[PDB]
Coordinates of C-alpha atoms (C1' of nucleotides) in Angstrom, one line a residue:
Chain F
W1 CA -0.9 9.4 -19.5
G2 CA -0.1 11.6 -16.5
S3 CA -0.6 10.9 -13.1
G4 CA -2.7 14.3 -12.8
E5 CA -4.6 13.2 -16.1
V6 CA -5.8 10.1 -15.0
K7 CA -7.0 11.7 -11.6
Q8 CA -8.5 14.4 -13.5
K9 CA -10.1 11.6 -15.9
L10 CA -11.3 9.6 -12.7
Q11 CA -12.8 13.0 -11.4
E12 CA -14.7 13.5 -14.6
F13 CA -16.2 10.1 -14.6
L14 CA -17.2 10.1 -10.9
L15 CA -19.1 13.8 -11.3
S16 CA -20.6 12.5 -14.5
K17 CA -22.6 10.2 -12.6
Chain T
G1 CA -2.5 -11.3 19.4
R2 CA -2.0 -11.5 23.3
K3 CA -5.8 -10.7 23.6
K4 CA -8.7 -10.7 21.5
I5 CA -10.0 -7.0 20.6
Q6 CA -13.2 -5.7 20.2
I7 CA -13.1 -3.6 16.7
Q8 CA -13.7 -0.3 17.9
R9 CA -12.0 3.1 17.4
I10 CA -8.7 3.6 19.3
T11 CA -8.7 6.5 21.2
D12 CA -5.2 6.4 22.5
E13 CA -3.3 8.5 20.1
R14 CA 0.1 6.6 20.3
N15 CA -1.5 3.3 20.1
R16 CA -3.7 4.1 17.1
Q17 CA -0.6 5.4 15.2
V18 CA 1.5 2.2 16.1
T19 CA -1.6 0.2 15.4
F20 CA -2.4 1.9 12.0
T21 CA 1.4 1.3 10.6
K22 CA 1.5 -2.3 11.7
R23 CA -2.0 -3.3 10.1
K24 CA -1.8 -1.1 7.1
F25 CA 1.8 -3.0 6.3
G26 CA -0.3 -6.1 6.7
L27 CA -3.0 -5.1 4.7
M28 CA -0.3 -4.3 1.9
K29 CA 1.4 -7.7 2.3
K30 CA -1.8 -9.5 2.0
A31 CA -2.6 -7.4 -1.2
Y32 CA 0.7 -8.2 -2.4
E33 CA 0.2 -11.8 -2.1
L34 CA -3.5 -12.0 -3.5
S35 CA -2.4 -10.4 -6.6
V36 CA 0.6 -12.7 -7.2
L37 CA -1.0 -16.0 -5.8
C38 CA -4.2 -15.4 -8.4
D39 CA -2.9 -13.0 -11.0
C40 CA -5.1 -10.3 -10.2
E41 CA -4.6 -6.5 -10.4
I42 CA -5.1 -4.4 -7.0
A43 CA -5.2 -0.7 -5.7
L44 CA -5.5 0.6 -2.4
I45 CA -6.2 3.6 -1.1
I46 CA -5.9 4.7 2.5
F47 CA -6.4 8.0 3.8
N48 CA -5.7 8.4 7.9
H49 CA -7.6 10.4 10.4
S50 CA -5.2 13.4 9.7
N51 CA -6.5 13.1 5.9
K52 CA -3.1 12.1 4.7
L53 CA -2.8 9.8 1.8
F54 CA -1.2 6.2 1.3
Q55 CA -1.4 4.3 -1.6
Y56 CA -0.5 0.6 -2.8
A57 CA -0.9 -0.7 -6.5
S58 CA 0.2 -4.3 -7.6
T59 CA 1.7 -3.0 -10.5
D60 CA 0.8 0.6 -11.5
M61 CA -2.0 2.8 -9.9
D62 CA -2.9 4.7 -13.0
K63 CA -3.5 1.9 -15.0
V64 CA -5.9 0.5 -12.4
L65 CA -7.4 3.5 -12.1
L66 CA -8.0 3.8 -16.0
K67 CA -9.3 0.2 -16.0
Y68 CA -11.9 1.5 -13.4
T69 CA -13.2 4.3 -15.6
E70 CA -13.8 2.1 -18.7
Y71 CA -15.4 -0.2 -16.6
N72 CA -19.4 0.1 -17.6
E73 CA -20.8 -3.1 -15.9
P74 CA -22.1 -4.6 -12.9
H75 CA -19.7 -5.5 -10.2
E76 CA -19.4 -6.5 -6.8
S77 CA -19.5 -3.9 -4.4
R78 CA -18.9 -4.3 -0.3
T79 CA -18.5 -1.8 2.5
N80 CA -18.0 -2.0 6.4
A81 CA -22.1 -2.8 6.6
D82 CA -21.8 -6.0 4.2
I83 CA -18.5 -7.3 6.1
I84 CA -19.9 -6.8 9.5
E85 CA -23.3 -8.5 8.6
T86 CA -21.4 -11.4 6.8
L87 CA -19.4 -11.9 10.3
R88 CA -22.6 -11.8 12.1
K89 CA -24.2 -14.5 10.4
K90 CA -21.1 -16.6 10.6
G91 CA -21.5 -16.8 14.4
Chain J
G1 CA -1.8 -23.5 6.5
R2 CA -1.3 -27.0 6.4
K3 CA 2.0 -26.4 4.1
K4 CA 3.6 -23.3 3.7
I5 CA 3.5 -22.0 0.1
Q6 CA 5.7 -19.8 -2.1
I7 CA 4.1 -16.5 -3.4
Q8 CA 3.7 -17.2 -7.2
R9 CA 1.1 -17.9 -9.4
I10 CA -1.1 -20.8 -8.8
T11 CA -1.3 -23.2 -11.7
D12 CA -4.3 -25.1 -10.8
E13 CA -7.6 -23.1 -12.0
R14 CA -9.8 -24.4 -9.2
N15 CA -7.6 -23.7 -6.4
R16 CA -6.8 -20.5 -7.1
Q17 CA -10.5 -19.7 -7.7
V18 CA -10.8 -21.0 -4.0
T19 CA -8.1 -19.0 -2.9
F20 CA -8.9 -15.8 -4.6
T21 CA -12.4 -15.9 -3.0
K22 CA -11.0 -16.6 0.2
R23 CA -8.1 -14.6 0.3
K24 CA -10.1 -11.3 -0.9
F25 CA -12.6 -11.6 1.9
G26 CA -9.4 -11.9 4.0
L27 CA -8.3 -8.7 2.7
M28 CA -11.7 -6.9 2.9
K29 CA -12.1 -8.2 6.7
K30 CA -8.7 -6.6 7.3
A31 CA -9.3 -3.4 5.5
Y32 CA -12.7 -3.2 7.7
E33 CA -10.5 -3.7 10.6
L34 CA -8.1 -1.1 9.9
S35 CA -10.9 1.3 8.9
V36 CA -12.6 1.3 12.4
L37 CA -9.9 0.7 14.5
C38 CA -7.9 3.6 13.4
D39 CA -10.5 5.8 12.1
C40 CA -9.1 5.8 8.3
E41 CA -11.0 6.2 5.1
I42 CA -10.4 3.0 2.6
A43 CA -10.9 2.0 -1.0
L44 CA -10.0 -1.1 -2.5
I45 CA -10.3 -2.1 -6.3
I46 CA -9.6 -5.7 -7.6
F47 CA -9.8 -6.8 -11.0
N48 CA -9.1 -10.6 -11.4
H49 CA -7.3 -12.4 -13.9
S50 CA -11.0 -12.4 -15.8
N51 CA -11.0 -8.9 -15.3
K52 CA -14.1 -8.8 -13.3
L53 CA -14.4 -6.0 -11.0
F54 CA -14.5 -6.1 -7.2
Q55 CA -14.7 -3.2 -4.9
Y56 CA -14.6 -2.3 -1.3
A57 CA -14.9 1.0 0.7
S58 CA -15.0 1.9 4.4
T59 CA -17.8 4.2 3.7
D60 CA -18.4 5.1 -0.1
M61 CA -16.5 4.5 -2.9
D62 CA -17.0 7.5 -5.2
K63 CA -16.6 9.7 -2.0
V64 CA -13.2 8.2 -1.3
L65 CA -11.8 8.2 -5.1
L66 CA -12.9 12.0 -5.4
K67 CA -10.8 12.8 -2.4
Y68 CA -8.2 11.2 -4.0
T69 CA -8.3 13.0 -7.1
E70 CA -8.1 16.2 -5.1
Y71 CA -5.2 15.2 -3.2
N72 CA -1.7 15.3 -5.6
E73 CA 0.3 16.0 -2.7
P74 CA 3.5 13.4 -1.7
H75 CA 2.5 10.5 0.2
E76 CA 3.4 7.0 0.2
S77 CA 3.3 4.8 -2.5
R78 CA 4.0 1.1 -2.5
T79 CA 4.3 -1.6 -5.3
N80 CA 4.8 -5.3 -5.0
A81 CA 8.3 -4.5 -5.8
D82 CA 8.5 -2.1 -2.6
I83 CA 6.8 -5.1 -0.5
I84 CA 9.0 -7.9 -1.8
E85 CA 12.0 -5.4 -1.0
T86 CA 10.7 -4.6 2.4
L87 CA 10.2 -8.6 3.2
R88 CA 14.0 -9.2 1.7
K89 CA 15.1 -6.4 4.2
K90 CA 13.0 -7.7 7.1
Chain N
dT1 C1' -17.5 -28.0 1.4
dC2 C1' -15.8 -28.3 5.8
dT3 C1' -12.7 -29.2 9.2
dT4 C1' -8.3 -28.7 11.0
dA5 C1' -3.5 -28.5 11.3
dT6 C1' -0.4 -25.3 10.5
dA7 C1' 1.6 -20.8 9.3
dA8 C1' 1.2 -16.0 9.7
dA9 C1' -0.3 -11.6 12.0
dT10 C1' -0.5 -8.9 16.0
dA11 C1' -1.7 -7.1 21.2
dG12 C1' 0.2 -6.3 25.0
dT13 C1' 4.5 -6.3 27.9
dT14 C1' 8.4 -4.3 28.2
Chain P
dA1 C1' 11.3 -0.9 18.5
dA2 C1' 11.7 -6.0 20.5
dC3 C1' 9.5 -9.8 21.4
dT4 C1' 6.4 -13.2 22.2
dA5 C1' 2.1 -15.4 23.6
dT6 C1' -2.2 -15.7 21.7
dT7 C1' -5.3 -14.7 18.0
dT8 C1' -6.6 -15.0 13.3
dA9 C1' -5.9 -16.4 8.5
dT10 C1' -5.7 -20.6 5.7
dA11 C1' -3.8 -24.9 2.5
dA12 C1' -4.8 -29.1 2.2
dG13 C1' -7.5 -33.1 3.3
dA14 C1' -12.0 -34.6 3.0

DNA sequence: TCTTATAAATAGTT
DNA sequence: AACTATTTATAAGA
């Protein structure tokens, strides 16, 4: 888990709602 | 402190920065104590007016942020409005 | 308060729950005050030992979290170890 | 749960 | 920045 990879994962999850 | 203050935006640039630094540390210190006393995980994200980022995490930010994305169900959610209202009806 | 306490896990379950609820509000109240007094944006995420989720945001959580994902630049980062360190040295 | 004695945070002065 | 009188938060009794 990269720092940017969890942030980028956080980004998806937000925009997905 | 020496006096009670109103909870209002401090316009003096120097007092704002001094207070920001003081209370941000206080806030993190309380987050530290809360995580340890009660065995909880806590992440805190602060952007100051200059849009600079400050961050605290009991253990590790990315674990908490990961834990957050996988959270499906209803939770407790509070904002400044909820806090103010709760304080009003403390009287 | 009545007796000073050490910062270590409370073993009595019910005092732990009482302390969690009271100090959680304390923390959120201090966040509210910092957010208004210094006009900053704050988000707070808490998972208790039972993995139940508690959240606070000055304005809107999703708004703050999103901006976080766009900001990777060098910033301040703290953990309990850092705080414990600063307390030693103060 | 409520109160309160006491510890902890902090506003103002400097 | 330090300090400190005062406000605030809170541990423990109830």
